[PDB]
Known about the structure:
This is part of a larger assembly, with chains A and B. Chain A is 13% helix and 7% strand. Chain A contains 2 helices and 2 strands, in the order ββαα. A two-stranded antiparallel sheet of chain A has the order 1-2. By secondary structure, chain B is of the alpha+beta class. Chain B is globular, with a radius of gyration of 18 Å. At the A-B interface, α2 of A face α1 of B. Chain B binds one RNA strand through residues 1-4, 9-10, 12-13, 25-26, 147, 153-155, 158-162, 168-179, 185, 187-197, 205. Chain A: Belongs to the universal ribosomal protein uS14 family. Zinc-binding uS14 subfamily. Chain A: GO terms for molecular function: rRNA binding; structural constituent of ribosome; zinc ion binding.
Amino acid sequence: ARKALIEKAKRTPKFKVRAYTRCVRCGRARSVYRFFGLCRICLRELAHKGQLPGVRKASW
Amino acid sequence: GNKIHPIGFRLGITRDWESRWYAGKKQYRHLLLEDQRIRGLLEKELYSAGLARVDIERAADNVAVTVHVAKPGVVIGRGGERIRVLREELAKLTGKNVALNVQEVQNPNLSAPLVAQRVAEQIERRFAVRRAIKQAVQRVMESGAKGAKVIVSGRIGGAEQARTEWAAQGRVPLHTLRANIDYGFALARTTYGVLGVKAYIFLGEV
RNA sequence: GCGUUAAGCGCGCCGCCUGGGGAGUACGGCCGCAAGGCUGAAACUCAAAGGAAUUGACGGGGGCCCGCACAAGCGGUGGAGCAUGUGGUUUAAUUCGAAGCAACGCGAAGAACCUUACCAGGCCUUGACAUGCUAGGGAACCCGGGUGAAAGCCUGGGGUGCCCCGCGAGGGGAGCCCUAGCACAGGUGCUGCAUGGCCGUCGUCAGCUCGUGCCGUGAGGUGUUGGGUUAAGUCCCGCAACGAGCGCAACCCCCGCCGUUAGUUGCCAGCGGUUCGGCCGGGCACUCUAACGGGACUGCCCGCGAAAGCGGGAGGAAGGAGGGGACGACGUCUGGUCAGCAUGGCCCUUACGGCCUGGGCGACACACGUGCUACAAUGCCCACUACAAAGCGAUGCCACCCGGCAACGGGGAGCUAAUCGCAAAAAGGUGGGCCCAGUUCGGAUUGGGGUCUGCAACCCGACCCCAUGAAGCCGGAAUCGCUAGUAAUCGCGGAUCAGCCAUG
Lengths: 60, 206
Ligand SMILES: [Mg+2]
Ligand SMILES: [Mg+2]
Ligand SMILES: [Mg+2]
Ligand SMILES: [Mg+2]
Ligand SMILES: [Mg+2]
Ligand SMILES: [Mg+2]
Ligand SMILES: [Mg+2]
Ligand SMILES: [Mg+2]
Ligand SMILES: [Mg+2]
Ligand SMILES: [Mg+2]
Ligand SMILES: [Mg+2]
Ligand SMILES: [Mg+2]
Ligand SMILES: [Mg+2]
Ligand SMILES: [Zn+2]
């Protein structure tokens, strides 16, 4: 998550196919979810703290 | 590594969402994100006051923001000029145009987040950890409540070894999906490393 | 432990000890046929040697007792082709981590570029990013040109208003740009045996403790042991304990019957019209929908028991925790992660910083792991035809027509979606073909053509079509999962995602 590498927000990609999601908290661009924009970690946490509306702990 | 978050494990019942509002599909993320921003500002500012929780409701370009503090006077300010700057500073961040409420804390001695930061501070002030702890605990214990329990990370005292401190009275049932246990985590930066502070508080039942 | 068979209370006398090792050894002496025996040191050396008892761990000790742990049983893995991970080989690089169970389709829910952290080459230094300082020119910013792979280097012209003071030229000054110096950014650069955080794991195992009292010089023990019962330290009875906490359970979610609520789901179920496709009238009954609520408690009857609890029966949708989730104690391992994030210390700051193109993360003659597809007729191919759930969709799902063998293109309706689309579900059923053969089994490899995505598909994409049609005839030692709607088997969906190596 090198600050520099956090330049996805640099619209100008030269070729859209070069854009990539990146976490919006960890930077951890590995496995992010579009809906929230959260590095799978920076999501299970907020979802626990309760800062993610309706994001209830699933269960069936 | 174990023991799920007592809060999130209770989000369905005895405990609710810090950010309640609807939307989705193509706004959620943007909107949601917006929340982390506020909470970002409210936290770096209303610290010396006792930020306890940050409810954030929405109804389209009309947010709520209801900061929970122990010393609301600090949030407010002299006659209320500071609730003018924050309230205004919040806009330069979100043009959504929202208000800002401030609900005092009925004996902060019962707000986990606070019972922790309390401890946290002491630690950074180089105070025997074992004490602040036993101290905090008794406080809660002694200010109503049916159960309390404080946990502090390692390096307690700059020990070269990463330890753990306990202390806890009354009943504190993390497994009972009804108990309604308040939780809170205080971080502790320090000359020798970082110490985490966990505080649970058990109140009544429903 | 001893206790009138005292290790009690006393008296008489005798022997003997005065740290361990060196040593019962050396020497002297006495004794013996001899083997040896009795008497018996020190130098040296070590901070101990040692006794009883407590907790625990361990035992090829014992009793009791659980878990697909074994057995019974079904399917599979180890053989092959391939896919994916890992090692070894190897490479300019093949970035890094993970390692017995508790690493090995694991981080990586998506490496052609990006990502990417590695390698070569070109290139920038207050920097791709944050706040602030000194001197100076000009300042916002917008549009061309040259070298170039790109970056970047060099460079050209439009264009400054904003506040105050001044007739005005013009000067001062705030936000900003740029050269230069500085504080400093930045670092996926070491350390998770400095850490938070979160996770794994023994263990969803049944346990781990506390208060008060009692026992004990004490460490601690008692309660938490015992008999019985339980999925369980669950409950009963006993007992110097009486309790209580964390855990167990219950509270919560989904599936089982039912009711209430609500009917732009659903139905000739009841009625008339029909382009008989429930299409329209109409009605909410049923289905479904999503909310609340009722409902099993060994409550009921028989029988065993002190009691708990256990066997059976009855009513009932459901029975003794109805199935499955969510939920993982005090603690273990210096378990994992400083590459998610955070942070202590160390280290780099014409560089372990940053940009770019190309390459690498994808190679093999090797081994293993986890997988898929098979080796066939309880099958395989073709035509016809039937029943599902759960999700997804505006910078998307795409009906319908025409084109092309097809991938798919071109046109193009509906839908911000229970009431449009992805969709045909497949195995199945019905007719028929193949007839046991590497064979209409198996689809690898390879040749050739072609579509799409994407700036680009050589290194490295998916897909369609023809051709080729390999290893493979059910797997050595050894090894895995599963006790039900499970295993086995058959499809459909999603996340990431341009596309996609998902046989995960
Ligand atoms: Mg960082
Ligand atoms: Mg002798
Ligand atoms: Mg002699
Ligand atoms: Mg002895
Ligand atoms: Mg002994
Ligand atoms: Mg079982
Ligand atoms: Mg067996
Ligand atoms: Mg094999
Ligand atoms: Mg029972
Ligand atoms: Mg159990
Ligand atoms: Mg439970
Ligand atoms: Mg280690
Ligand atoms: Mg790889
Ligand atoms: Zn994140």
